[PDB]
Design a protein around this motif. Structure first.
Motif, PDB file in Angstrom:
ATOM      1  N   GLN A   1     -18.936 -91.796  20.367  1.00 15.23           N
ATOM      2  CA  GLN A   1     -20.200 -92.207  19.769  1.00 15.23           C
ATOM      3  C   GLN A   1     -21.375 -91.792  20.638  1.00 15.23           C
ATOM      4  N   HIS A   2     -21.169 -91.735  21.951  1.00 19.77           N
ATOM      5  CA  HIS A   2     -22.204 -91.224  22.836  1.00 19.77           C
ATOM      6  C   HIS A   2     -22.466 -89.758  22.532  1.00 19.77           C
TER       7      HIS A   2
ATOM      8  N   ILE B   1     -23.793 -88.582  31.024  1.00 17.63           N
ATOM      9  CA  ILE B   1     -22.462 -88.167  30.606  1.00 17.63           C
ATOM     10  C   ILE B   1     -21.822 -87.277  31.659  1.00 17.63           C
TER      11      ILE B   1
ATOM     12  N   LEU C   1     -29.137 -89.503  28.402  1.00 19.21           N
ATOM     13  CA  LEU C   1     -27.760 -89.622  27.940  1.00 19.21           C
ATOM     14  C   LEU C   1     -26.937 -88.402  28.323  1.00 19.21           C
TER      15      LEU C   1
ATOM     16  N   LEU D   1     -21.688 -94.634  33.188  1.00 22.82           N
ATOM     17  CA  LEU D   1     -21.499 -95.134  31.837  1.00 22.82           C
ATOM     18  C   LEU D   1     -20.032 -95.017  31.450  1.00 22.82           C
TER      19      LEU D   1
ATOM     20  N   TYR E   1     -24.480 -89.249  19.292  1.00 22.51           N
ATOM     21  CA  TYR E   1     -25.930 -89.367  19.321  1.00 22.51           C
ATOM     22  C   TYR E   1     -26.577 -88.075  19.791  1.00 22.51           C
TER      23      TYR E   1
ATOM     24  N   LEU F   1     -17.753 -93.800  28.656  1.00 23.98           N
ATOM     25  CA  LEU F   1     -17.978 -92.810  27.617  1.00 23.98           C
ATOM     26  C   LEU F   1     -17.115 -93.044  26.386  1.00 23.98           C
TER      27      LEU F   1
END
Lengths: 336, 336
Positions: free
Chosen positions: B140-141, B100, B96, B135, B144, B137
């Motif tokens: 909420q990403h 990002i 992740l 992804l 985590y 973005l």
């Protein structure tokens, strides 16, 4: 997006300006209400008679009228073509106050979103005042009329004229106008609230004395006696009675309209007002926080730092009389 | 429309995030500065090595890899076509955190107003990371990733990635992006200032102890012990030392940038913090108001209600080291 019914604001504006049936009109929006007051207001005046101010006139005429100005006559040699420069007082309705009414009515018609009957009726009035000359209105025009020679009735409609022009925005078309969304901005609505109470309390609370009080910091600084940098502090209102004094701070916030967190940042101002204020009478010191809410009104009391403080609300949108009853009920509790 | 030079904000952001040459870049605007940090920041990581997290993989393969799952194999009868469902740990950079970075770089390129070289260099990097998947973005990403397993260096660039996405607005075109005018809004700039100091003071003021302190009203109410309606009060910072305690309230206002009236409404909050706070140590109690100004810095002291209070300013736009010197000079005066 919850807001107050528009009709109730007009009542608060009335006390704000310090001086009728609104059930008849079917347009809830403000300009429909406000124009109908003015459109009827003009007609109410004409029944009694509009202001006529003697304007001295110095002009070149073929004869004697009033007082002849000998100098301008001989200097221009107007005697020879049978004329004189003489001063006399033609009586007109073309005064600044009346010109403002006519110019305001032009703006009222041009507003794109308005009841048709209101627009129809006003256009009659514009024609019915031929002598008066249209003008391009500015606050500076209203500034010159702060002398307030006019009657008490004139000042009401002029206050309306002040409200309309400032709260008028051009919309779809270049010529036409569109009304400001007054309710949405908190500051002007809040500034209405603070002024609404100050003049209101003078009316109803004949028992107590109601004054705005400036306060001075207890501080001393070696740097400056002036203390200019320090915040200027002037109460919203003080409502002093022999048995008890009371300071009120009132503000309009959107967060409180939602029934969660509470916006009470104004309270931070309040204690310093209680602190900097020292009463010679020493009867008591109390404070009040009052806000507008829509649905319901709740009253609480507090004992914080040796002070008796209340946080309370009013259910605007209920009805004006019960609101008037509610306010008298409110001050009755704490003023004791 | 006076504002701070953009480079200096990055230094305050660094302490805000709690962890280089900026003279080289010629683009004063923020995104040029911010992208060059990231664009170099990615390359700095690759030298040491990017994070590789063992992702367990359960898949259908023609043979034994790692641990075979007997159940899924027999239930699907995969033995017959020479296959097994087995669990094994392929090592990827597709985490992740790294996803990002790649998604952020796509956003960075798409920004319409940007240095061309910055855009050119980043497009290389996007190609240089084939394995990683793009992804879309959201915060909420980032939520985590609050676990913060990653190294200390990763958290810096990710903080940048948080700043960029939130401060990105679509502009002329649907695909491309346009940078937010961060400086103009006071609240986010102000919230930066309050957080900037809190982490900054921990660094430099090793002598004193620096903590944010929650405060409780001295009030009691018969209605509720909770006092939920009362404003929640949490200090911006408290910087306590054995000889003297000190509370600071810092805010960014536009009015003060003009060299007239002064905006010190925050001071109203301050006294109640001094009042509600009671020190067991009883060494002393002091307060500070600190604001940003552009041109010059001025320091004053006050003796208001038994409290020793200072109002002071800092000349942002001068230079970062003298600013760093100035802040240490500032706290040195009052912390005594």
């Amino acid at each position: 997006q919850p807001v107050i019914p528009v009709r109730n604001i007009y009542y608060m504006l009335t006390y704000a300006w310090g001086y009728a049936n609104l059930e008849a009109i079917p347009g809830n929006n403000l300009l429909d209400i406000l124009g109908y007051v003015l459109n009827k207001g003009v007609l109410q005046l004409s029944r009694r008679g509009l202001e006529l101010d003697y304007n001295p006139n110095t002009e070149i005429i073929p004869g004697i009228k009033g007082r002849i100005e000998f100098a301008k006559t001989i200097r221009g040699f107007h005697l020879n073509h049978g004329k004189t420069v003489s001063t006399f007082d033609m009586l007109n309705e073309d005064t600044l106050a009346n010109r403002i009414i006519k110019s305001t009515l032009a703006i009222l018609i041009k507003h794109e979103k308005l009841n048709s009957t209101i627009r129809d009726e006003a256009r009659s009035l514009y024609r019915k005042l031929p002598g008066i000359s249209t003008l391009h209105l500015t606050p500076q025009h209203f500034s010159y009329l702060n002398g307030g020679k006019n009657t008490r009735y004139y000042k009401f409609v002029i206050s309306v004229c002040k409200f309309i022009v400032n709260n008028s925005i051009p919309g779809q078309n270049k010529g036409h106008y569109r009304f400001y969304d007054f309710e949405r901005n908190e500051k002007e609505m809040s500034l209405l609230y603070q002024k609404f109470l100050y003049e209101f309390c003078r009316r109803e609370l004949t028992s107590a004395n109601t004054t705005r009080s400036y306060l001075k910091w207890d501080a001393s600084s070696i740097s400056d006696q002036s203390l200019n940098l320090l915040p200027r502090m002037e109460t919203d209102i003080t409502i002093r009675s022999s048995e008890k004094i009371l300071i009120v701070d009132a503000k309009y916030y959107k967060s409180i309209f939602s029934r969660e967190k509470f916006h009470s940042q104004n309270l931070y101002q309040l204690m310093n007002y209680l602190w900097s204020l020292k009463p010679e009478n020493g009867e008591n010191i109390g404070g009040l926080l009052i806000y507008p809410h829509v649905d319901t009104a709740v009253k609480h009391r507090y004992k914080i730092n040796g002070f008796d403080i209340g946080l309370c609300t009013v259910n605007l949108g209920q009805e004006w009389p019960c609101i008037h009853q509610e306010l008298l009920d409110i001050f009755d509790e704490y003023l004791k």
